[PDB]
Amino acid sequence: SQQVDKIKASYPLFLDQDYKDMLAKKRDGFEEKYPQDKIDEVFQWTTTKEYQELNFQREALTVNPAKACQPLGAVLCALGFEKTMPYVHGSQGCVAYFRSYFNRHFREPVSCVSDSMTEDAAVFGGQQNMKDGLQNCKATYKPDMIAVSTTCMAEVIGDDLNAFINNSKKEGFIPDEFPVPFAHTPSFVGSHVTGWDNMFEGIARYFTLKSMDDKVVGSNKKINIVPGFETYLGNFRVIKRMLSEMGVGYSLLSDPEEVLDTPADGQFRMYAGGTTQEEMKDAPNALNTVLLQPWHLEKTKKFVEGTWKHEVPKLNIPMGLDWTDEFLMKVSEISGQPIPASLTKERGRLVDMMTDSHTWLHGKRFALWGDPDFVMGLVKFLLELGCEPVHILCHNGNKRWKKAVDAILAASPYGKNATVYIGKDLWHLRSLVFTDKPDFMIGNSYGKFIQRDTLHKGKEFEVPLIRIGFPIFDRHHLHRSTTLGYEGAMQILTTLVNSILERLDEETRGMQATDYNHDLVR
Amino acid sequence: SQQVDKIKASYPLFLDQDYKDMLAKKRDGFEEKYPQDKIDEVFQWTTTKEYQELNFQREALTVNPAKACQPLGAVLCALGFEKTMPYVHGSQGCVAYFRSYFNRHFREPVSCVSDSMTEDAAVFGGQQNMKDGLQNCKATYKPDMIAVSTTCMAEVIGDDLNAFINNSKKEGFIPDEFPVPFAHTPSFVGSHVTGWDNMFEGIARYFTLKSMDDKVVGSNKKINIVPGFETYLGNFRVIKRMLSEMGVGYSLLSDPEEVLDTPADGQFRMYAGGTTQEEMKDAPNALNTVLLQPWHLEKTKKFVEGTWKHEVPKLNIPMGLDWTDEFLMKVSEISGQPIPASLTKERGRLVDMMTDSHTWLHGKRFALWGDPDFVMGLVKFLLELGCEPVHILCHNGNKRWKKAVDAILAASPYGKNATVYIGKDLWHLRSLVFTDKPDFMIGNSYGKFIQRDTLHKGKEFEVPLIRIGFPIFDRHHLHRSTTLGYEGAMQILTTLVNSILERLDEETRGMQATDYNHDLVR
Amino acid sequence: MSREEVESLIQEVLEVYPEKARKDRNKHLAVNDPAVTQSKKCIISNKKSQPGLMTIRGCAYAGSKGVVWGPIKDMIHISHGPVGCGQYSRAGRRNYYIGTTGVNAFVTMNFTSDFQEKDIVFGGDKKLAKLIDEVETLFPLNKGISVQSECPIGLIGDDIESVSKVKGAELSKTIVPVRCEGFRGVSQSLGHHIANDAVRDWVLGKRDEDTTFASTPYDVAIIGDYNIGGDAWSSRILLEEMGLRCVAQWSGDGSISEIELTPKVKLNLVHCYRSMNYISRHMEEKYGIPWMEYNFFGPTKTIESLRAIAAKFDESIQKKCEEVIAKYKPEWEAVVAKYRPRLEGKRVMLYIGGLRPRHVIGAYEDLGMEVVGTGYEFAHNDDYDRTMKEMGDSTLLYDDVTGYEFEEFVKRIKPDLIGSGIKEKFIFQKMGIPFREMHSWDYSGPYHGFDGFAIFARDMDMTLNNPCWKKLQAPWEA
Amino acid sequence: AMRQCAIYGKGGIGKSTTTQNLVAALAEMGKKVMIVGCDPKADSTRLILHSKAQNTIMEMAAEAGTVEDLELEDVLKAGYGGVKCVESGGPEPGVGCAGRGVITAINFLEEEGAYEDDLDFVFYDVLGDVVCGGFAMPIRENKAQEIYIVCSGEMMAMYAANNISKGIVKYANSGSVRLGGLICNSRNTDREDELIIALANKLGTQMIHFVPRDNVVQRAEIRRMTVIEYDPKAKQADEYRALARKVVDNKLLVIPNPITMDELEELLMEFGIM
Ligand SMILES: Nc1ncnc2c1ncn2[C@@H]1O[C@H](COP(=O)(O)OP(=O)(O)O)[C@@H](O)[C@H]1O
Ligand code: ICS
Ligand code: CLF
Ligand code: CLF
Ligand code: ALF
Ligand SMILES: [Fe+3]
Ligand SMILES: [Fe+3]
Ligand SMILES: [Mg+2]
């Protein structure tokens, strides 16, 4: 029953007595459910150390992974280019999932097409699918470029993308001069960040491999910036703003911020902004190429050093204080422009915020997960703040990345209790936060479930989730935030300290019980 | 006892068994307090409607006021001028309190001096205090201008600021040309915003009143912007950014953002930035003067219309979509510059966020309080989002402001259940949120206590606090936020929708009880 | 360093003042020398602040309402006058209490008469009576009303005593009029004195003709402990762990019942001499209750004070004190063994109100830290007399230091850590010097007793050794 | 036009009565005048309005919220001969703070534009005991230009006039306010005129029209009017006409050089004996 004045959605409609009675009767009479005592005992067992040992002995089963497949990152990278349609050779369910994922994260339209390879296409190959799909996409959505990635089925059967696109061009399905960069993106290799790297390398080599004779390094006096897999629009914006204030000429290749942040003014823009084709053509003329997230831009690094002949600098992701300083100083040493006073003042204001908040930040223990470069930057910044990143999980990390992060932890007194896990999923991490409880965990929306689980052990065991990373589905407009540069460090610091303070306020809100510490001034 | 490995601060030190036993024994033996049943009965009574009637019949007692006294606003206004020392004629305890208040809100140094009027100065007048204080302050802190306000004692005894400063100048305590603007700021009249208005009017007439002969309106082709009492640095920044993007020449008088956001680089800067004296001298030459918060800039409006001969536009505070649009169109019609495409795109992105979040925002009921212009802007924006501002409280509001806000509510279908209270304190609002419960309350840090009180009636009656306004003491770096313009509206929308979503996540976190609605995707 | 250089530093700092201000301020700065018997020749204090010099001092209202009266839980304290004072003083001081706020406790609430212009012109006595009636109607569980005067009340001669008497008789309530108008005195010290006199005249004598309280020989009352961060509690658990019965706490977590029961106790343990020595002397000379100064800052001072207090009782109390010392010895020893190596040899400068500038020196020295500069906002001659026996040789002493003076002293001395209030914190944080709030404990604490010592050492190490202080200079600058 | 005068002097020396009679004389000469009473006793406009001015700025402001809600027409009322009359309100004796009320009332008059054009004179009748800065509100900058001190041959009256001059000195140096002269109200003392003239010379000023003590004033004021309304042809009415004429044609505006207590005693021995 409902009252027309106050209408209850599912919560709290299904807390009504009739609905509770119905659910109890359903479970009692037809579900054959385990007894509540058995369920409680099994949950308590799952929160134990022996269960964690069993969990970490897993070899074949993955539970709640913290990664996606390559073509998602390929689609994002392709989206970062002007009037470019992402085109995934393979089955259409993949494209539907990629679009839904990015739609839920960004709350914006995400354009991507499939060539709809069915069983007959699996058996006979996707040549006809490629020809018809390229023709249909170009005629329907009028892109100036079609960037081709693959689903797992086309990678298993060896659908040769190069041959398929070439045959499409020579047979008149698409114009011969129409740019169709391609990249093999096997979903059973690496992760979504690997797909981003592969797609970017494909686009770069499409626009630069053959026409290298007339290229001389530095002739355009710009700096190439490769962002990598990035889902914070403020990160693109902050890199652009810091380079603009610095008087540095730059070329941000794969810039998707405009297409993912279009206005609602009565019309739908399928394409907006993005790296122009001329930018990629002229990229070899740059003074140098700086990789924003080098640890999933290895293939791009090999191509840039071996083909464009750019001495790509060894820079960590510009996250936190020290690494933003290093990034700015390297940009200075490359372009010859000095670091301006506005950037110095922004750095000083970040330092002032750190001094203002160190008492609440110091000693705080964290479990964090995400992509390797983001995770490493977060670890470095947390060490800068005096926090303890006790659990550091990277599902798609590798041994060398683990070595680098271990060396970073060894250089700080606040990395003594820190452990780096690679190839582990969020079930491992839920065990980790049960058996060695941190104060907070930082990660994407999936971590919410871990928080729920911790709250079931009790309020004193609950590990609150701080939502930084990808994807964030249960909050609105957090994709607009920043994590790079001094501005990103300021936003992260504000989020961390205010999460701590809100947690403390909640834990001291009980009148005559804990409100003696419910201080107005913190 | 303490474990050296894990040291407990007061929370949760005093939850230990020995401390709990000590507190219980102290209460039983020596406190002679009311029985817990009696305390529960009285609390339940205070949450009732009859108690609210008794509360709203109050005529003499104020409990938890949502306002401050005039000299606080005078000090804030004076701080927005270059190398200007705020100087409060009267008792030094006032200056200590103003400085502590602003230090806790901004987490920054706040420079202000007193002439330390004691009982002998109260009886004989503080003319010697004025002479010695002006001389000492100028010799010690070398300000380029000393801006003089008053405490209540100097206003009661009629300390003639003009005569005192003039005598100090003629007797050689301070140079005759040294600028010493003054304003009478009685704490028993108006509130802190009135003090801001009074101080600004005094500073304006000090630099402009006697030299109006060689002034012609529009000759500098600039626009005067008066911000009023503003404690969000992002508001100054957004007004500056929006005017400079528009290509409009502007002069923001009383700009304190630099002095309240100095960097930590091994140096303490007592002064930084601020409106120069030449800007105030040239202000009568402007095309027009726009008052950002007109409802506490009445004296400034009268002076600017009657002395500078500027036809001050009838503009509401540039908060929310419609009023930011009106502000931009008025600035365009004054300066002659068109609204640029970047501002239009920012407005469109605001609209996109509104459409992305309307389902969660729509129908939400709010109790809010603060200064009149900020409160009115919040009410207008909440109406734009489809929210219901049911309890609109403004302690320092007046009848005309109440009528304007009532007319605003009548123009929208979402203002039907809204009531505007003026002269009511936060105890009135505690009663209001107990008897007509909103979903959230928006206000400064004091509202936290109301939240505590609501949580004592039960978790279902708890009204969470959203911290927007002044002062904010229990969170860090919120003073850096923005509330004006499209950017401020975006920040407010993000805060509101994510507060709603975090509340819903908390209410659906109970496994097997309410977690059926613990959705990953919201 | 060296008695001569610091004197030269004092003269150089004073050089910028006008001659009157320089002549005044020279008498408020000194170099410590334990060869001095009376601080009158050394340093003078408790004098008028020089105008326009940006002093740190508060007012008598701050010393009365904000310090002494405010912490009392079950009493409602009304800031009589305009709205500013109570609003700025609302919950700025962390005098911790246990109660139900708004029902039977009111500490963090701001009760005010909110004087308008007509209240100044025509008087506020009728408004005060109506306010008392409204307080009764809306807060019926309050156990006392105090009326803290602000500046206009003192100026216009409002007869708050008459209102208090009439309304108290009419309602059988204790209504205490406090003439703590801010312009009286020179600082919070006269606020302390006025508040103590109000307690003596209106509260302390209510149970004089009452013998229904059972008194044990081990009855002590804690005086001048305001439960900052739970300080008093951390202190109290020690005393009652050595057999003593803590009848009263003044005034942090304090009830009016405890103040009324104070004359029934046998000993008065004064923590803050400066704020409550007046009432301690009054009770000594009226009820014959001896009072002793103690100190619960750091293990050395805590043990010394516990043994001194035990020596005033039977052998059972002394055995219980010894067992308390032996029980808590490993914990503070572990705290030292953990945090002293991180803090040994670090120099600290202090500037707090009237007791802590000298009381916490032992706690710092327990961690190998040397206090090179100290000073008071509002201490008297006797406070500096007590300070000389605690400060080291050739250490800077300042009274009512100005912002300029203290900034220059810090620049020259270059201490590793500064302990002062909220109005110096961000100034010295921007100079790259670790800062600890020594009033509010930087929203941490307690610092009293052994648990307080553990927290204090943790905070000192956390702020002193924070990595942020190594990042003040941008790497692209020399 | 627009001459702003402030009437001060020893308590009860006859400031209100002389001010009202002088204002009546000035208004009978076609001069537009306005009387502002800065005494919480709103008794400085009774002989002009023929009744006690019940409506005062402070009382109206307290009744009607604050002073901003007020209107001039509710406190500014005409009387005999076009004399506009306003009164600053005040508490009953022994309570509140009347100086703050005077400050607020005068600020309200300034802000509401009571000082319009076609107003030749504005007379601020102030109380005799200037106890605070508030009652010096009339002699603030740009408020009153001339100060008239009513005195008499009594030692206390001359001491009060000298003390008032000492208080004036700070405002006179701060602004452009000066001492026009010493109006003398006769108290029938030995060498009254000699004492007033000597004191005025010592202060650096003049004695303007020593006014005789006559009961026609008492009669006229008990009939709720000035002498001009009561007996225009009486001797004291002509004396008030002469006082008005001497006020109009006055140019001795000086900063007083007040004399110490010793010099005052020498003046009393020199001119107060025989
Ligand atoms: N020239 C005068 N002749 C007779 N009586 C006078 C004269 N001047 C003043 N008075 C009387 O002396 C008394 C003094 O009252 P008032 O004029 O109000 O003095 P003040 O305004 O200084 O307080 C009045 O009653 C008045 O009738
Ligand atoms: S009362 Fe005094 S200024 Fe003795 S007014 Fe002040 S809570 Fe200080 S050095 Mo704030 S004489 Fe207490 C003090 Fe000391 S408020 Fe606290 S810390 S021990
Ligand atoms: S149509 Fe359907 S969703 Fe597509 S793959 Fe095939 S079953 Fe699966 Fe899978 S890992 Fe990624 S999303 Fe694909 S490329 Fe393969
Ligand atoms: S020294 Fe002390 S704090 Fe100052 S006033 Fe006086 S009692 Fe109070 Fe009050 S309302 Fe504001 S803060 Fe003052 S100007 Fe008056
Ligand atoms: F007694 Al008066 F002016 F009325 F001196
Ligand atoms: Fe800061
Ligand atoms: Fe959208
Ligand atoms: Mg008179």
The residue among C246, C270, C247 whose CA lies nearest residue C260 is: C247
The residue among A264, A258, A251 whose CA lies nearest residue A233 is: A258
CA–CA dist A453, A45 (Å, integer)? 13
Tell me the CA–centroid distance for residue A387 and ligand 6, in Å.
19
Q: What is the number of helices (H) and of strands (E) in chain D?
A: 10, 7
CA–CA dist A518, C107 (Å, integer)? 12
3-state DSSP assignment of residue A1: coil
Q: In this complex, is the C-beta atom of B210 within 8 Å of any C-beta atom belonging to chain D?
A: no
Ligand 5 contacts CB of residue D11 (under 6 A)? yes
Cα dist. A517→A507, C94, D213 in Å? 9, 9, 77
The residue among A214, A202, A337 whose CA lies nearest residue A285 is: A214
Resolution in A: 2.1
CA–CA dist B491, B481 (Å, integer)? 8
SS (H, E, C) B245-293: HCCCCEEECCCCCCCCCCCCCCCCCCCCCCECHHHHHHHHHCCEEEECC
Q: What is the number of helices (H) and of strands (E) in chain C?
A: 21, 14
Report the run of H or E that residue B502 belongs to, with start and end: helix B485-507
Cβ neighbours of residue C207 closer than 8 Å, sequence gap 6 or more: C213, C260, C261, C263, C264
Of C48, C152, C184, the CB nearest to B116: C48
Cα dist. C368→C348, C355, C361 in Å? 11, 21, 11
Q: Do C276 and C381 lie in a common domain?
A: no
Could you tell me where the DSSP H helices lie in A270-321?
277-282, 298-303
Give the pair of three-digit tokens for residue A87: 């085109």
3-state DSSP assignment of residue C350: strand
CA–CA dist C250, C269 (Å, integer)? 10
**Of C317, C334, C364, which residue is a domain's last?**
C317
Q: Which of residues 100-139 of C touch D (CB under 8 A)?
A: 116-118, 120-123, 125
Which chain residues have CB less than 5 Å from ligand 8, an ion?
A: D 15-16, 44, 125
- Which atom of ligand 5 lies closest to the CA of D10? 5
Residue for token pair 């309100």: D89
CA–CA dist A362, A249 (Å, integer)? 39
Q: Do C64 and C197 lie in a common domain?
A: yes
The answer to whether C88 and C80 have CB atoms below 8 angstroms apart is no
Q: Do C197 and C292 lie in a common domain?
A: no
Tell me the CA–centroid distance for residue C103 and ligand 8, in Å.
53
The residue among B303, B297, B292 whose CA lies nearest residue B208 is: B303
Q: Nearest residue on chain C to A364, judged by CA atoms?
A: C462
Could you tell me where the DSSP H helices lie in D175-260?
192-203, 215-222, 227-230, 235-248
Tell me the CA–centroid distance for residue D93 and ligand 5, in Å.
13
Contacts of D99 in chain B (CB under 8 A): 156-158
Q: Which of residues 243-302 of C touch D (CB under 8 A)?
A: none
The answer to whether A162 and A182 have CB atoms below 8 angstroms apart is yes
Is residue D222 exposed (0-12), middle (13-18) or buried (19+ Cβ within 10 Å)? exposed
- Virtual CA dihedral for B120, B125, B131, B132, nearest 10 degrees? 10
The residue among B386, B465, B395, B455 whose CA lies nearest residue B424 is: B395
Chain A touches chain D, with at least 3 Cβ pairs below 8 Å, answer no
**Of C146, C170, C202, which residue is a domain's last?**
C202
Is residue A230 exposed (0-12), middle (13-18) or buried (19+ Cβ within 10 Å)? buried
CA–CA dist A115, A129 (Å, integer)? 5
Give the pair of three-digit tokens for residue A227: 């962002």
* Total domains, chain C: 3
The answer to whether C150 and C113 have CB atoms below 8 angstroms apart is no
The residue among B117, B120, B209, B203 whose CA lies nearest residue B155 is: B117
Ligand 2 contacts CB of residue C272 (under 6 A)? yes
Q: Do C372 and C298 lie in a common domain?
A: no
The answer to whether D45 and D53 have CB atoms below 8 angstroms apart is yes
Give the pair of three-digit tokens for residue A333: 């040493």
Range of the domain at C359: 1-59+342-476
Q: Would you mind telling me the total number of residues written for chain A in this entry? A: 522
DSSP character for B304? Answer: I
- Virtual CA dihedral for D2, D8, D13, D16, nearest 10 degrees? 40
Q: Which amino acid is at A336?
A: G
CA–CA dist A166, A174 (Å, integer)? 10
Which neighbouring-strand residues pair with B182?
B148
Of D97, D137, D140, the CB nearest to B156: D97
CA–CA dist A328, A340 (Å, integer)? 10
DSSP character for A336? Answer: -
CA–CA dist B8, A517 (Å, integer)? 13
DSSP character for C270? Answer: E
The answer to whether D27 and D77 have CB atoms below 8 angstroms apart is no
D13 appears as a binding residue in the annotation: yes
Give the pair of three-digit tokens for residue A470: 């990808």
Cα dist. D65→A48, A462, B297, B399, D61 in Å? 69, 55, 20, 11, 6
Q: Which amino acid is at B428?
A: H
DSSP track, C401-418: -BHHHHHHHHHHH--SEE
Q: Do C26 and C67 lie in a common domain?
A: no
Q: Do C107 and C91 lie in a common domain?
A: yes
Q: Are strands C417-420 and C76-80 parallel, antiparallel or unpaired?
A: unpaired
Residue C335 in any domain: the answer is no
Question: Do you find a cis peptide bond into B10, omega within 30 degrees of 0?
Answer: no
D16 appears as a binding residue in the annotation: yes
CA–CA dist B225, B275 (Å, integer)? 11
The answer to whether B299 and B197 have CB atoms below 8 angstroms apart is yes
Q: Which amino acid is at B258?
A: E
The residue among A152, A30, A47, A23 whose CA lies nearest residue A97 is: A152
**Of C247, C282, C317, which residue is a domain's last?**
C317
Give the pair of three-digit tokens for residue C309: 């207090």
Residue C337 in any domain: the answer is no
CA–CA dist B374, B381 (Å, integer)? 11
Quick check: A517 and B11 CB within 8 A?
yes
Per-domain boundaries in chain D: 1-274
The residue among C441, C79, B460, C97 whose CA lies nearest residue A518 is: C97
The answer to whether A112 and A85 have CB atoms below 8 angstroms apart is yes
- Backbone angles phi and psi of B225, in degrees to 5: -120, 120
DSSP character for A415? Answer: G
3-state DSSP assignment of residue C84: helix
Give the pair of three-digit tokens for residue D211: 């006014």
Residue C331 in any domain: the answer is no
Largest distance between two CA atoms of chain C: 76
Give the pair of three-digit tokens for residue C57: 């001092």
The residue among C280, C279, C299, C268 whose CA lies nearest residue C367 is: C299
Q: Which amino acid is at C222?
A: I
Technique of determination: cryo-EM
C62 catalytic per annotation:
yes
- Backbone angles phi and psi of B422, in degrees to 5: -125, 145
Residue C360 in any domain: the answer is yes
Ligand 3 site residues, Cβ closer than 6 angstroms: A 69, 71, 91, 93-94, 97, 151-152, 187
Chains in touch with B (3+ beta-carbon pairs under 8 Å) read: A, C, D
Tell me the CA–centroid distance for residue B271 and ligand 6, in Å.
15
